[PDB]
Design a binder for this molecule. Sequence first.
Ligand SMILES: OC[C@H]1O[C@@](CO)(O[C@H]2O[C@H](CO)[C@@H](O)[C@H](O)[C@H]2O)[C@@H](O)[C@@H]1O
Ligand SMILES: [Mg+2]
Ligand SMILES: [Mg+2]
Length: 244
Amino acid sequence: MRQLLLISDLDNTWVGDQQALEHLQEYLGDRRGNFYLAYATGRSYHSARELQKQVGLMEPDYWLTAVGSEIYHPEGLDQHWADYLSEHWQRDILQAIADGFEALKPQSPLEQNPWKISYHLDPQACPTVIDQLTEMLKETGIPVQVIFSSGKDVDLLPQRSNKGNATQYLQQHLAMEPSQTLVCGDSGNDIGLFETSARGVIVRNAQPELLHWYDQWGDSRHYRAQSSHAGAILEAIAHFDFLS
Ligand SMILES: OC[C@H]1O[C@@](CO)(O[C@H]2O[C@H](CO)[C@@H](O)[C@H](O)[C@H]2O)[C@@H](O)[C@@H]1O
Ligand SMILES: [Mg+2]
Ligand SMILES: [Mg+2]
């Protein structure tokens, strides 16, 4: 029932330029009732909350955490989404395979969750190994997807997660149209967002994988911002003429 569904990543997107973050929130703070806000971050919910206290993030309506593996409503964790992602998902088997790759090191336990298996790619290893991993995982028949970002982070998720799939789910939940949605991102774990039909903005300080993605799949609905961090979000809002 609002005119805009604003979905943004936190680190290096909404966060990173304190001054821009502040004037973005100042502006949005004057029309809080005109948009729904969702933070689609790679961070776990707890980590997202700690970041909010650190930089003073304005309260969102929804939290799409751990790359969309967990959704939090004002009332709490979405159990329907959890059950939906659990269907056909076989975490143990995928982890056994990923654990077998010498170039991969598990990320700390707190970065893991039932629908998220994450690793760090050896900076000395050949990035081509991610393609081999992806092929090997896909051939298990288990609905899985591999998210590679910043040239070092690897996340194993159900094919039904993404920041993009979590976003389409939220859109349907709120009865918001893609034309009324703006996704904001900076890296490989944001590609799912740009795969949706929502309007999107790629921050100036975006990672290589995202820019390369844009070069190949970028379309009319995708905006390459001149500003970096939160400034890119204000820029996009004006560009797509949202919150008229
Ligand atoms: O957003 C980039 C920045 O976030 C961190 C915070 O720890 O990593 C998060 O996003 C990664 C990509 O999805 C996940 O693999 C990781 O588990 C999650 O914490 C930084 O590592 C990263 O540079
Ligand atoms: Mg980021
Ligand atoms: Mg990102």
